Short mmCIF file of C-alpha atoms in Angstrom, two decimals:
data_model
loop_
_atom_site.label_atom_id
_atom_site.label_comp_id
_atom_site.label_asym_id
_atom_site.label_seq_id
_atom_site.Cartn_x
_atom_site.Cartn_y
_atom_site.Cartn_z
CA UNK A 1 -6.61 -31.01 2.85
CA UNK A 2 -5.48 -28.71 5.49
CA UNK A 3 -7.92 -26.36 6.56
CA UNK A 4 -7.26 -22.18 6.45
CA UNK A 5 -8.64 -19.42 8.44
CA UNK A 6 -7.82 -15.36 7.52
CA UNK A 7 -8.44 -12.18 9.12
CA UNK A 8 -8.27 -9.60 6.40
CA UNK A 9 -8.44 -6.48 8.87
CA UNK A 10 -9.00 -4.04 6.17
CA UNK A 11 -8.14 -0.68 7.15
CA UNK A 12 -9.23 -0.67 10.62
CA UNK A 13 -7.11 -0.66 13.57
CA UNK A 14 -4.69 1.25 16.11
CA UNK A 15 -1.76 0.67 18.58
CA UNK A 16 -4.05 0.38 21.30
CA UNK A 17 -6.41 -1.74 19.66
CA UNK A 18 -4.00 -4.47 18.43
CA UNK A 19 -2.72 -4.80 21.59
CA UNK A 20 -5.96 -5.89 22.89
CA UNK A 21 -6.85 -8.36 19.69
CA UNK A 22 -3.70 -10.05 19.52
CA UNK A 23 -3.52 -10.98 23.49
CA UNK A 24 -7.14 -12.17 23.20
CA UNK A 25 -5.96 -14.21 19.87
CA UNK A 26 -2.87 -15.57 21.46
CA UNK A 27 -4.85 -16.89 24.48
CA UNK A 28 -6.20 -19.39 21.84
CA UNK A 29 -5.04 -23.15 22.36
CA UNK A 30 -4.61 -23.15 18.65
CA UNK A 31 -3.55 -26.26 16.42
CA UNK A 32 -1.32 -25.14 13.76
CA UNK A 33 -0.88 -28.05 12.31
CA UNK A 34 -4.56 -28.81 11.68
CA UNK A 35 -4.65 -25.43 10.50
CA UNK A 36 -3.11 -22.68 9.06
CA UNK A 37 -4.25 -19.12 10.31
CA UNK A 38 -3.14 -15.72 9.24
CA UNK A 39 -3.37 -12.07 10.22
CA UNK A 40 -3.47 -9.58 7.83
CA UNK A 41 -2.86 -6.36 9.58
CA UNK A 42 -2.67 -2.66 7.74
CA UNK A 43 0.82 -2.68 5.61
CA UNK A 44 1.95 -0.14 8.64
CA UNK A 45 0.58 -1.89 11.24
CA UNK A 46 2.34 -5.48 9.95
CA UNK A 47 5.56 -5.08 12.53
CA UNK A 48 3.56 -4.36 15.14
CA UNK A 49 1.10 -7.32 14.85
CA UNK A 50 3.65 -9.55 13.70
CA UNK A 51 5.50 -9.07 17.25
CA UNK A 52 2.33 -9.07 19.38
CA UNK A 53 1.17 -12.31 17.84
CA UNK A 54 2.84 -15.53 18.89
CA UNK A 55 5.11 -17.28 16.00
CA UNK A 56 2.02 -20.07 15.59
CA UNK A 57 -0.14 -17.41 13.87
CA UNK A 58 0.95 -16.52 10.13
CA UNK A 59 1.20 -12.97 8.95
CA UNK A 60 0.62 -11.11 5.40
CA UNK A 61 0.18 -8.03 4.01
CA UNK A 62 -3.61 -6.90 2.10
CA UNK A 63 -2.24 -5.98 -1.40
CA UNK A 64 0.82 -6.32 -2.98
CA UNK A 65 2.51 -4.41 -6.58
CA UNK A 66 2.15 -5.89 -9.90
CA UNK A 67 5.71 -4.11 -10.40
CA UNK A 68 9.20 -4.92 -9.06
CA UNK A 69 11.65 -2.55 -7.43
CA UNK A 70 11.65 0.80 -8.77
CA UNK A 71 9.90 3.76 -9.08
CA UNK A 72 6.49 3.16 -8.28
CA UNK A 73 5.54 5.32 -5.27
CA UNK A 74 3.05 3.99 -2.53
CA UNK A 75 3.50 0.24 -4.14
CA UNK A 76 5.26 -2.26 -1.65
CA UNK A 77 6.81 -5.02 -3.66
CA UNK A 78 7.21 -8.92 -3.53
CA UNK A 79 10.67 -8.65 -2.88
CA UNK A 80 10.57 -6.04 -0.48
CA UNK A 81 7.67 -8.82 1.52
CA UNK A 82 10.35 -11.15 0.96
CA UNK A 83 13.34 -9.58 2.65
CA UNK A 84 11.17 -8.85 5.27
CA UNK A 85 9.57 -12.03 5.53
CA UNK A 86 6.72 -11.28 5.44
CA UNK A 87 4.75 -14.87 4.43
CA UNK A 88 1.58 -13.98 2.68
CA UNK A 89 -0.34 -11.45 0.86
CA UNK A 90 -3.92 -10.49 -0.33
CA UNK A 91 -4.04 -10.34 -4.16
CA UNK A 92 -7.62 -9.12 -5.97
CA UNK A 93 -9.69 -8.54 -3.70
CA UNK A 94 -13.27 -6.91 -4.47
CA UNK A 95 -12.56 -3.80 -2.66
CA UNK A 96 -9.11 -3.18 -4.78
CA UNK A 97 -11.00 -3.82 -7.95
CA UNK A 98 -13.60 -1.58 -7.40
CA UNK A 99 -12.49 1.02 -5.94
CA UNK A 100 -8.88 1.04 -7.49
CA UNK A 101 -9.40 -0.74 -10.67
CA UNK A 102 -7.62 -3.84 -10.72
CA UNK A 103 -7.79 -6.09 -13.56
CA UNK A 104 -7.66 -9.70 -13.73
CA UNK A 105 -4.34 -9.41 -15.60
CA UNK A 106 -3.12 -6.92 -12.47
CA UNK A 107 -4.27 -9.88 -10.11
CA UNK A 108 -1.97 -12.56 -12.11
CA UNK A 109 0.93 -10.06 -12.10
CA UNK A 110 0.78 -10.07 -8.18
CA UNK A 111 0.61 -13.71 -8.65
CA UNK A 112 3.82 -14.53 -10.68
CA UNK A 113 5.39 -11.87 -8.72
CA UNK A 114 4.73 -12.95 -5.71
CA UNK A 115 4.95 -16.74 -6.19
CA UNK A 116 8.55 -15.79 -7.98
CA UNK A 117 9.55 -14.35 -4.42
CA UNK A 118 8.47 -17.40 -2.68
CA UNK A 119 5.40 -15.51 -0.93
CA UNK A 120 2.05 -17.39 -0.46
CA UNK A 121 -0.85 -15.64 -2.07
CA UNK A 122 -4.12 -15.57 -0.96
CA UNK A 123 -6.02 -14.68 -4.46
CA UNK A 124 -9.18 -13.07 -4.45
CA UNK A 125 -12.09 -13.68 -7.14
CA UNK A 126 -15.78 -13.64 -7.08
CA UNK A 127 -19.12 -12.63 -8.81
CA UNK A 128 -21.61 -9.29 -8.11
CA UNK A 129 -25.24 -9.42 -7.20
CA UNK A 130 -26.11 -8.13 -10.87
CA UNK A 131 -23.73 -11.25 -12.22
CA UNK A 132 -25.28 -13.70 -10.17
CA UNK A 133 -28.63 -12.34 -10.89
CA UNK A 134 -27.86 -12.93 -14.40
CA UNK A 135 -26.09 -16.09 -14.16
CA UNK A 136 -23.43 -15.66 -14.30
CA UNK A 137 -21.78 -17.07 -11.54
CA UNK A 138 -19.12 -19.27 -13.09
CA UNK A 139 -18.91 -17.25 -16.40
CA UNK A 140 -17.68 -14.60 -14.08
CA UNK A 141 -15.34 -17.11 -11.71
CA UNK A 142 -13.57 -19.19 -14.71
CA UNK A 143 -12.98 -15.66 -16.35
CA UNK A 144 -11.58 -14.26 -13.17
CA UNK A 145 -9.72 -17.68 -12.58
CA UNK A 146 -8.78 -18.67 -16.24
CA UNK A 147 -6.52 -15.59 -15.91
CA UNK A 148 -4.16 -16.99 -13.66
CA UNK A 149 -4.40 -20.22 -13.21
CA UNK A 150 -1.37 -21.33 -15.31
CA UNK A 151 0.71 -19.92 -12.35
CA UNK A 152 -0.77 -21.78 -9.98
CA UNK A 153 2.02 -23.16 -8.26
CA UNK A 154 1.03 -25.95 -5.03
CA UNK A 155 -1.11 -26.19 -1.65
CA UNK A 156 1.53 -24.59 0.03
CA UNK A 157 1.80 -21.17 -1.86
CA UNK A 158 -1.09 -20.30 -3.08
CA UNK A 159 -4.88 -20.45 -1.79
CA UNK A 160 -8.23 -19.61 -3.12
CA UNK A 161 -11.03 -17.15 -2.39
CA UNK A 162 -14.38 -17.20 -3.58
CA UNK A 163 -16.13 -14.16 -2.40
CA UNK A 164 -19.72 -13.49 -3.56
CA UNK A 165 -20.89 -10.16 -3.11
CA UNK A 166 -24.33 -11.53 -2.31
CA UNK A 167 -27.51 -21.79 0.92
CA UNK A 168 -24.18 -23.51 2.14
CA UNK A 169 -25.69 -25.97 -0.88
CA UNK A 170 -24.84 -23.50 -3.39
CA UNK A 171 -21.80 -21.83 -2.60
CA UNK A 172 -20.60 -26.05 -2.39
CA UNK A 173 -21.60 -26.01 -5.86
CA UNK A 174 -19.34 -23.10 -7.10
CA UNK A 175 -16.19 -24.25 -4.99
CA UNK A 176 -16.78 -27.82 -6.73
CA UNK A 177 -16.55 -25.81 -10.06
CA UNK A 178 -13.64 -24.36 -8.59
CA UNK A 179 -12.39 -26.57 -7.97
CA UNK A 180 -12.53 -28.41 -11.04
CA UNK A 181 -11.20 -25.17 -13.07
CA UNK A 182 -8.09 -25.80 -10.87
CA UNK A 183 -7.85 -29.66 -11.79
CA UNK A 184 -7.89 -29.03 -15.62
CA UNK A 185 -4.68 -27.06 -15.07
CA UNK A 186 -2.86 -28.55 -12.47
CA UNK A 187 -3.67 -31.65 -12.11
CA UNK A 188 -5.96 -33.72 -9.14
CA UNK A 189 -2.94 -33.90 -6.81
CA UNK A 190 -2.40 -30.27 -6.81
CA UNK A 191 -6.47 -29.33 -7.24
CA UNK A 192 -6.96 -31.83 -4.08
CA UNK A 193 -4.59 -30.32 -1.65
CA UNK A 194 -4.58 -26.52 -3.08
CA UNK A 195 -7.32 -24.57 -0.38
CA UNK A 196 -10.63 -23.02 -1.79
CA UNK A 197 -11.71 -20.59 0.71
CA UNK A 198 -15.21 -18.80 1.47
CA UNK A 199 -14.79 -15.23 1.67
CA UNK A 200 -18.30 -13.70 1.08
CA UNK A 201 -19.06 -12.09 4.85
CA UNK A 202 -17.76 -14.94 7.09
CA UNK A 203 -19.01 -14.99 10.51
CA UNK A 204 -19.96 -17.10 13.81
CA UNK A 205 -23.29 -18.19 12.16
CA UNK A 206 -22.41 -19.49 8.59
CA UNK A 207 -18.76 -20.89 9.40
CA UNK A 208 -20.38 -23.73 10.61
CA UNK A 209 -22.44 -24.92 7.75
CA UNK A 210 -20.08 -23.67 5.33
CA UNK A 211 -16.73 -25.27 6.92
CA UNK A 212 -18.39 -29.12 7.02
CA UNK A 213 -18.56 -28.12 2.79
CA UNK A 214 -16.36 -30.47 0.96
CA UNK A 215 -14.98 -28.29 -0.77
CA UNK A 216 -14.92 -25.08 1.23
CA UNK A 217 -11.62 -25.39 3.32
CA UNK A 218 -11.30 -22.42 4.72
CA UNK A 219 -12.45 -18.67 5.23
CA UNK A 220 -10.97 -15.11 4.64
CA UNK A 221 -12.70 -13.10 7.27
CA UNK A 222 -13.49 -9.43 7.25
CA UNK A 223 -15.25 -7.39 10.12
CA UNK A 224 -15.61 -10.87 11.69
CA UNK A 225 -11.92 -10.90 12.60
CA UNK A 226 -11.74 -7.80 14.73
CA UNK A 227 -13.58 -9.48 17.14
CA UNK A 228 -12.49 -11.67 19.92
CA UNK A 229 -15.22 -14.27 18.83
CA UNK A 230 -13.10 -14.96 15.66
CA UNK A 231 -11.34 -17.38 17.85
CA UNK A 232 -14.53 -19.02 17.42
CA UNK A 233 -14.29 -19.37 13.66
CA UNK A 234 -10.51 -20.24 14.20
CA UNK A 235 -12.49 -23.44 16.30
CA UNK A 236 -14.79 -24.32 13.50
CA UNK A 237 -12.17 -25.27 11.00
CA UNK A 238 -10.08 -26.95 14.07
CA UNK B 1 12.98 34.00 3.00
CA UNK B 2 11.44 30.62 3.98
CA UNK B 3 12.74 27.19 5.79
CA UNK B 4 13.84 24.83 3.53
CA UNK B 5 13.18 21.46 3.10
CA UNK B 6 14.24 18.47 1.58
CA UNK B 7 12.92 14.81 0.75
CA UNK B 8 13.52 11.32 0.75
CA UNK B 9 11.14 9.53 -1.76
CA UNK B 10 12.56 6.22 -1.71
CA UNK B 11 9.82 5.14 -4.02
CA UNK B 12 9.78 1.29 -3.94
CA UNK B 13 13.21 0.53 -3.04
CA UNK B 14 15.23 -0.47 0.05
CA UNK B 15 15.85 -3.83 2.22
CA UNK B 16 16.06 -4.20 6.04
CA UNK B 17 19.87 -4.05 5.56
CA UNK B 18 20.23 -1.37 2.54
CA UNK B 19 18.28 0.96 4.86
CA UNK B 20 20.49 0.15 8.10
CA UNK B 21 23.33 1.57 6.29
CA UNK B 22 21.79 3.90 4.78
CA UNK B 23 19.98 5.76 7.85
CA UNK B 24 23.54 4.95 9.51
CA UNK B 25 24.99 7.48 7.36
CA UNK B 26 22.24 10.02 7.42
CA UNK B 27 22.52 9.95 11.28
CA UNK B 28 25.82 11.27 11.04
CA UNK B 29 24.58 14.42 9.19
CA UNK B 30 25.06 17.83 11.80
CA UNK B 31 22.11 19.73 9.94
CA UNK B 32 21.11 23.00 11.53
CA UNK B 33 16.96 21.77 12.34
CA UNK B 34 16.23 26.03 12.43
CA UNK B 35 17.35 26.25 8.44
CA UNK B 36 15.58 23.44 7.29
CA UNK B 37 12.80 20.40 7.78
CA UNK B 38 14.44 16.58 6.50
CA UNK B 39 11.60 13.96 5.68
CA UNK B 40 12.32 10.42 4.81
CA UNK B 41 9.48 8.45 3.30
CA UNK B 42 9.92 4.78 3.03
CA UNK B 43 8.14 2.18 1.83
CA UNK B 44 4.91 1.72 3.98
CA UNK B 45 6.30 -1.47 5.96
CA UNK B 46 9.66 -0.21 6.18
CA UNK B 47 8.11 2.84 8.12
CA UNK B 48 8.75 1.81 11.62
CA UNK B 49 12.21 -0.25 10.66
CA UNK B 50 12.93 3.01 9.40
CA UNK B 51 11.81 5.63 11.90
CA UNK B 52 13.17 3.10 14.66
CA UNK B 53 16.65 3.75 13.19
CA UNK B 54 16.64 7.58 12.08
CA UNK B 55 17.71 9.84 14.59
CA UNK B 56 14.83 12.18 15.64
CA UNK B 57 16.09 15.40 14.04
CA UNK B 58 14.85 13.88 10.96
CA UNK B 59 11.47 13.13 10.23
CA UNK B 60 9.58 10.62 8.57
CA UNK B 61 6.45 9.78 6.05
CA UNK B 62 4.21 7.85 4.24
CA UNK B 63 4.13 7.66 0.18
CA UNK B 64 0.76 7.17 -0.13
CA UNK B 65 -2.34 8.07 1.70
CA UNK B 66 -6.24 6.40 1.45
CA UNK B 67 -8.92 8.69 0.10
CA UNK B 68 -11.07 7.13 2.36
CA UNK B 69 -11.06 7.24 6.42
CA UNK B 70 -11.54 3.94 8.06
CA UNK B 71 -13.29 0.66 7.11
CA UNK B 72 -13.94 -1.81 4.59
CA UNK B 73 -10.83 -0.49 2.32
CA UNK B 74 -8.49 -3.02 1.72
CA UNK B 75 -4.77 -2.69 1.16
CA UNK B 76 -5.11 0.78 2.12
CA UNK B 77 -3.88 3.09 5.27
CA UNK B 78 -6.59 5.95 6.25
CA UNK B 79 -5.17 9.68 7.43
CA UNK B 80 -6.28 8.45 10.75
CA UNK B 81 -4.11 4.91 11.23
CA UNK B 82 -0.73 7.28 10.50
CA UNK B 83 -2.15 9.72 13.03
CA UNK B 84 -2.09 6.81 15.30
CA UNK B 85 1.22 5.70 14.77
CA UNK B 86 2.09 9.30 14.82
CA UNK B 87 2.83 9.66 11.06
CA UNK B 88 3.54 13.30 10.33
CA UNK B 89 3.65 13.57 6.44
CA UNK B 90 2.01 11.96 3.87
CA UNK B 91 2.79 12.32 0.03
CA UNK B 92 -0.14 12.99 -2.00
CA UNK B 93 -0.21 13.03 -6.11
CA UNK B 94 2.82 11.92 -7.11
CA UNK B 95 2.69 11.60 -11.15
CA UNK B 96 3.35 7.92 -10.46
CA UNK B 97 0.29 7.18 -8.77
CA UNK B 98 -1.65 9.00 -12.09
CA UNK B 99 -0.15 7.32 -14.39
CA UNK B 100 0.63 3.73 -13.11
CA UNK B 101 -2.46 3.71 -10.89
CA UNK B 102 -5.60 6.07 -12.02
CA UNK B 103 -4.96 8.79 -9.17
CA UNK B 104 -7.30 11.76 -10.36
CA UNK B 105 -7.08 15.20 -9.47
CA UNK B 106 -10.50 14.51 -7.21
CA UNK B 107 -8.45 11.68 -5.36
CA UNK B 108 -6.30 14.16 -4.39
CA UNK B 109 -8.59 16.16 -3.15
CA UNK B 110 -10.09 13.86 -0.90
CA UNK B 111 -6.81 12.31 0.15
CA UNK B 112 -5.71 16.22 1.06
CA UNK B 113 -8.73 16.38 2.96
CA UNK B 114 -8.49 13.38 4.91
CA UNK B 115 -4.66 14.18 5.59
CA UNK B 116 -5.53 17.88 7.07
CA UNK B 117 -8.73 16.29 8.83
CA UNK B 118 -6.61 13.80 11.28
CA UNK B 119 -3.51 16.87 11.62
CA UNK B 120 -0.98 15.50 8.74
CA UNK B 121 1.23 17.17 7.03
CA UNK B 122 0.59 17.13 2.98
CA UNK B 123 3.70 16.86 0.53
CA UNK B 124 1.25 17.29 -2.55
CA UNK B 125 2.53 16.83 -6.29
CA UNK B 126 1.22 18.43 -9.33
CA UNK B 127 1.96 19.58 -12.62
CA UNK B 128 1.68 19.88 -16.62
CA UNK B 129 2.36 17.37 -19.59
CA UNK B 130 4.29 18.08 -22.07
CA UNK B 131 1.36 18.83 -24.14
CA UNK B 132 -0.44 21.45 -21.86
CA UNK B 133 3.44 23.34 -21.61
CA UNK B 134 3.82 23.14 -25.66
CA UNK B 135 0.43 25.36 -25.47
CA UNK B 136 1.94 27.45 -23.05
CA UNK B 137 -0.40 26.43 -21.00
CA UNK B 138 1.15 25.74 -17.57
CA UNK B 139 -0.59 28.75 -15.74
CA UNK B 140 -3.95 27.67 -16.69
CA UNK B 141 -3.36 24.05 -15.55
CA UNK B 142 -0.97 24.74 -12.08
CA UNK B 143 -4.02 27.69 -11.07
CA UNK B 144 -6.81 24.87 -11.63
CA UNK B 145 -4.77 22.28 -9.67
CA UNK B 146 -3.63 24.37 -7.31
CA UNK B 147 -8.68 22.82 -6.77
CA UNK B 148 -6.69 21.76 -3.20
CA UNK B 149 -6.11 25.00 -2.16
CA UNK B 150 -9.50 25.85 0.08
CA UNK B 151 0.45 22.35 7.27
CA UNK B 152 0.80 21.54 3.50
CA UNK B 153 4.09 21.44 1.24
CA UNK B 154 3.91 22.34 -2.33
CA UNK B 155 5.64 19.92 -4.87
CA UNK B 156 6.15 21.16 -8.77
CA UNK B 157 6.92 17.26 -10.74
CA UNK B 158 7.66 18.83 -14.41
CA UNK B 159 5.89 16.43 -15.87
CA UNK B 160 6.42 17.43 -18.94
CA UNK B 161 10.53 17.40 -18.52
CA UNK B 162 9.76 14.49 -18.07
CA UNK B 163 12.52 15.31 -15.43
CA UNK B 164 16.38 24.21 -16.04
CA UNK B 165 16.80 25.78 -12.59
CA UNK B 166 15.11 29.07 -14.56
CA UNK B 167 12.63 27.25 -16.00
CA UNK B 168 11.65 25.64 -12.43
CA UNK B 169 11.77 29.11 -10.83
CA UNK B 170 9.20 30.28 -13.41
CA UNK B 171 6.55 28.06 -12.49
CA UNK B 172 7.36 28.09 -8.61
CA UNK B 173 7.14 32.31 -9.03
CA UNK B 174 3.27 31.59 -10.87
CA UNK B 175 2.28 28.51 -8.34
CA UNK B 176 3.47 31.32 -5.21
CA UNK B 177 1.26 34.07 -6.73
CA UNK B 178 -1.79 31.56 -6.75
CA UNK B 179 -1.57 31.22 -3.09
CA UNK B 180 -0.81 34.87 -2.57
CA UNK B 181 -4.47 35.33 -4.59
CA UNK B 182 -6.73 32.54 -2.59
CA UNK B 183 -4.66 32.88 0.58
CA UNK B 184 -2.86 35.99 1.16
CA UNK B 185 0.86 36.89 0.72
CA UNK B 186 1.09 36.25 4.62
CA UNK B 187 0.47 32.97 4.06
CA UNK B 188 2.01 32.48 -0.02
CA UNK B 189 5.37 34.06 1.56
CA UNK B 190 5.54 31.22 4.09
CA UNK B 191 4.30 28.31 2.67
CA UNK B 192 7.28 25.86 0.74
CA UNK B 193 7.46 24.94 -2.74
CA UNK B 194 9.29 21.85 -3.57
CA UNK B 195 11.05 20.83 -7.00
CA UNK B 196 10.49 17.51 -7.22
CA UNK B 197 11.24 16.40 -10.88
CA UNK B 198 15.16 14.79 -11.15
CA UNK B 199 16.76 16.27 -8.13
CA UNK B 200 20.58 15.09 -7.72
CA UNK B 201 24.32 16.06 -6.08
CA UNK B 202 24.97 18.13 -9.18
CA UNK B 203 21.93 20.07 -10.14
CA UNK B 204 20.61 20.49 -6.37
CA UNK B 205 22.59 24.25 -5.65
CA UNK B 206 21.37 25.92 -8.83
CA UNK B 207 18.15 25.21 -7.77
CA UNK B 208 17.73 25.43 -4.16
CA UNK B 209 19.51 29.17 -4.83
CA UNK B 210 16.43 30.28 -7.24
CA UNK B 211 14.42 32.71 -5.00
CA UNK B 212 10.77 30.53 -4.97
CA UNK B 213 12.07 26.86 -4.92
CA UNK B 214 12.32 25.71 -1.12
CA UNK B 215 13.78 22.29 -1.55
CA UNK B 216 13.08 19.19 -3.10
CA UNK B 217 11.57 16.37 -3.30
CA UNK B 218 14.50 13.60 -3.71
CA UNK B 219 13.65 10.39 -5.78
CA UNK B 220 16.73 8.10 -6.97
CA UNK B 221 19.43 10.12 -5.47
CA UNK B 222 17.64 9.86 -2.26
CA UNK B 223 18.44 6.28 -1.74
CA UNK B 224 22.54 7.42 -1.80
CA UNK B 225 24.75 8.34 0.92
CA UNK B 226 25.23 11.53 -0.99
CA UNK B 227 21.90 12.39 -0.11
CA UNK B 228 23.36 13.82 2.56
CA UNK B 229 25.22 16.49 0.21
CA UNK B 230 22.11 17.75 -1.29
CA UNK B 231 20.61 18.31 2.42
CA UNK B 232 23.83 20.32 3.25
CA UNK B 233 23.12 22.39 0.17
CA UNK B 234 19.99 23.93 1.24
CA UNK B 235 22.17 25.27 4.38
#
C-alpha cells in the first residue's frame, strides 16, 4: 500500500504567504513514488500554488458540486476540475457538513461525479465527541460509509478519511473496521491497496505513532500543513 | 441619472478554451468606461485564467463569498483572500445559493459584512416568491430584505417570474425609495439597481430604458458573444 500525505489548507492563505510555503515545500528531497502528497490550496488560490509547487507534489481543490454544468452559482464542477486538470478534490468534510449541511447522499454525489470525470477523491467521514461518547463510533462510520461505498472505484482514485472530532490503539481499531466495510464491497484486492487516512488533527507528535498503524496509510492535515514542519510529516510516511 | 452596469454571471459554466474565445471577443468591445461599469464573474478557479485574459477596462468577480473571515472553513474563500488577490466584487444571495444550498437571509448578512469589512464591492440578490407577490406582498418582503441595508450593487431576481420591463420598474421604483428612507436620496439617487432575473439580446433595451433599472445581472446569455450587444445597449 502506498502511503498518502494531504495538506487541506482550509481557508487560510495569501500571495505572499504561498510563496513562502511552497519554496520551503519544494526544498523537500521528496519520494513520490513511495508517496503520494497533495496540496489543497483555496479554489482561488489553486493556479497559483499549482505553479509555485514543483510537478512532484499533487494538487486538488477542498470541495467540489454534487451538480454538473449549469446554473448553480458559486459551485465549481467535476468537469470544470477536469478540463483544468485539476487531480483531486476534498469531498465531506466535517466543516462542510456542519456548517453547510451536507448530507451523506451530497458526499456520494461528489463521488460519482467526480470519479465519472476521472478526478481522485479524497472522501471525508467521521464520528462527533457526543457519538463516540455514546458509541457510536462505527454506527456512525458504516452509515457515513455505507452511503457510498458502491462507487468506490480503485487505490488510484479514491482515498479514505477518518476524522474523529475527538490511543494510536484505537483509532487502528476503527481503520481495521474500515477497512473491512470497504472489503465487503469491493473486494480484498481493492480494500488492500485503496488508502485509509487519519484526519482527526494530524501533527508532528501523533504522525509517528499513528503512520507505523497497519492500517492508517496516510494523513489529511489541517493547521499542521501551513507550517514548514509539515515536511516533517511528509518524512514520517516516507 | 446613474452609471450603468452590466454582468457576467457565468454560473457554473465555461472551459479553459470556451473562455479564451469568449474573453477574445469581449476584448474587442470599444465601451465608453464613463457610461458604464462591466463585471465578469467566473467560476472561482477560472478567476485568474479569466482576469489574466480580459482586458482591464473590464472588471472581474467572485460568485460566491464565505460568511466567515479566515480559518478552519473548508472549501470556502473569506472577503479577505479576494482582497488579497485583489478581487473587487463579490456576488452575494443569488436565489441559487437559497434554494440549492440553504443560503438564509442572515448568511447574507454576514457575507455583506465581511465583503464591506475587507473593501469589496457587493452585487447582492434578493427578492419575492411567487407566493409573497400573489399577496401583493412584494413591498413588505423587498423593505425587510433590503435587513443589509445598515460600494454595494442592488440586484432584483423576480423570483417569483420565475424569470415585464413595467413590472421590473415597479419594484426597482419601491426597492429605490427604501434606500432614499434608511439612507438619504443623496445616496438612493446614486446607488445601482440591477435586474437580474432572464436578461437577454432581445428584452435587454426595454429594460435598461425604464427610469430605476441600472443594468443587469446577465446569467445564460452572458456566456454568448452577443453579450457584447446587451453591454452596448446600456450606452
Amino acid at each position: 500500500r502506498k502511503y498518502f500525505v494531504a495538506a487541506n489548507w482550509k481557508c487560510n492563505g495569501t500571495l505572499e504567504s504561498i510563496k513562502s510555503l511552497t519554496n520551503s515545500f519544494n526544498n523537500l528531497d521528496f519520494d513520490p513514488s513511495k508517496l503520494d502528497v497533495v496540496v489543497f490550496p483555496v479554489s482561488v488560490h489553486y493556479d497559483h500554488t499549482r505553479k509555485l509547487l514543483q510537478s512532484k507534489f499533487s494538487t486538488g481543490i477542498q470541495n467540489v458540486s454534487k451538480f454538473g454544468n449549469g446554473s448553480y452559482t458559486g459551485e465549481v464542477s467535476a468537469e470544470i476540475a477536469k478540463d483544468l486538470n485539476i487531480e483531486y478534490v476534498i469531498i465531506g468534510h466535517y466543516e462542510r457538513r456542519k456548517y453547510f449541511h451536507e448530507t451523506d447522499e451530497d458526499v456520494r454525489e461528489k463521488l460519482q461525479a467526480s470519479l465519472k470525470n476521472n478526478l481522485k477523491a479524497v472522501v471525508c467521514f467521521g464520528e462527533s465527541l457526543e457519538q463516540r461518547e455514546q458509541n457510536k463510533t462505527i454506527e456512525v462510520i458504516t452509515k457515513q460509509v455505507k452511503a457510498f461505498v458502491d462507487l468506490i472505484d480503485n487505490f488510484d482514485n479514491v482515498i479514505l478519511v477518518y476524522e474523529p472530532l475527538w490511543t494510536p490503539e484505537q483509532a487502528q481499531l476503527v481503520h481495521k473496521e474500515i477497512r473491512k466495510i470497504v472489503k465487503d464491497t469491493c473486494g480484498e484486492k481493492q480494500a488492500n491497496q485503496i488508502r485509509i487516512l487519519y484526519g482527526g488533527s494530524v501533527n508532528t507528535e501523533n504522525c509517528s505513532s499513528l503512520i507505523q498503524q497497519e492500517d492508517i496509510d496516510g494523513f489529511l492535515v489541517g493547521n499542521a500543513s501551513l507550517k514548514e514542519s509539515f515536511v516533517d510529516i511528509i518524512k514520517s510516511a516516507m
